[PDB]
Amino acid sequence: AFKNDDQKSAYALGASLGRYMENSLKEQEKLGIKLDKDQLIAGVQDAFADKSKLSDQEIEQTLQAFEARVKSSAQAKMEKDAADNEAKGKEYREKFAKEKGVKTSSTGLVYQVVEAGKGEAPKDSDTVVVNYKGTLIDGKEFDNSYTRGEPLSFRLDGVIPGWTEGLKNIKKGGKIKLVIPPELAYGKAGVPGIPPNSTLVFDVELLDVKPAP
């Protein structure tokens, strides 16, 4: 429905801008910001027609303020999600602790030894080799050793405490399920890939234990 290039290009140009906006909004939505969509289009129209209800200076100071509002809204979201994640997490940890063979350490680690292991147990300065699979309590995975095409080996005092504590509950050749509260893991802050305050679930197999070189 374009009769010429002038029309097609113009439309393509608009379309690409319309998609640009649509995608920016979705980005904003994930930070807890929902912009009035009709106003957004009304701004485009008004300005294009030289009838913006905001002055160029206003537009510019408002966008600057919006930037601040985004950083700030993200912060608030982070904290909201942090509260929800620990609420869910606490409930999950509490159900799991009621299952067979499950123990809760004074630190709050919930663990289940599945195979005792016959070697010895690692200590803080030891390098461990492990197979593992980790997920969030909704069951979605963030790490799989397995799929990575290989197991991992690392010194034990480097990793998060929930883990270092957990792997000390078994010996070489052992298997253990760890349910780690956020404070033994990535905290309320969290890290890229792990949401704020999340409880982590790991199946771990300890393949080997080596002393610090």
Q: Which residue is nearest to Cs ion (CB)?
A: 102
Q: Which does 102 bind (CB under 5 to 8 A by kind): its own copies, Cs ion, none?
A: Cs ion
Nearer to its own copies, 59 or 212 (CB): 59
Please list the active-site residues: 132, 142-143, 160, 186, 202
Nearer to its own copies, 9 or 144 (CB): 9
CB of 135 to Cs ion, least distance (A): 21
From residue 1, how far is each of 5, 23, 36, 55, 114 by CA, in Å?
Answer: 11, 25, 30, 36, 66
The number of C-alpha atoms within 13 Å of 17 and in the hemisphere containing its C-beta is: 9
Rounded distance between C-alpha atoms, residue 189 and residue 4, angstroms:
54
Site for Cs ion in 77-106 (CB under 5 A): 102
Interface with its own copies, residue 7, by CB under 8 A: yes
**Among 24, 27, 21, 28, which residue's Cα sits nearest to residue 42?**
21
Q: Which does 23 bind (CB under 5 to 8 A by kind): its own copies, Cs ion, none?
A: none
CB of 85 to Cs ion, least distance (A): 24
Interface with its own copies, residue 150, by CB under 8 A: no
Interface with Cs ion, residue 113, by CB under 5 A: no
User: Mapping DSSP to helix (H, G, I), strand (E, B) and coil, where does residue 75 land?
Assistant: helix
Nearer to Cs ion, 102 or 207 (CB): 102
Is 175 exposed, middle or buried (CB count within 10 Å of its CB: 0-12, 13-18, 19+)? Answer: middle
Rounded distance between C-alpha atoms, residue 165 and residue 129, angstroms:
15
Site for its own copies in 27-56 (CB under 8 A): 33-37, 39-48, 50, 52-54, 56
The encoded tokens of residue 45 equal 């129209």
The angle subtended at Cα 129 by Cα 123 and Cα 134, nearest 5°, is: 100
Q: Which does 18 bind (CB under 5 to 8 A by kind): Cs ion, its own copies, none?
A: its own copies
Rounded distance between C-alpha atoms, residue 132 and residue 7, angstroms:
57
Rounded distance between C-alpha atoms, residue 23 and residue 30, angstroms:
11
Interface with its own copies, residue 76, by CB under 8 A: no
Q: Which residue has the tokens 């999600």?
A: 81
| Binding interface with its own copies (CB under 8 A) | 1-2, 5-19, 21-22, 33-37, 39-48, 50, 52-54, 56, 58-60, 62-63, 65-66, 69
| Binding interface with Cs ion (CB under 5 A) | 102
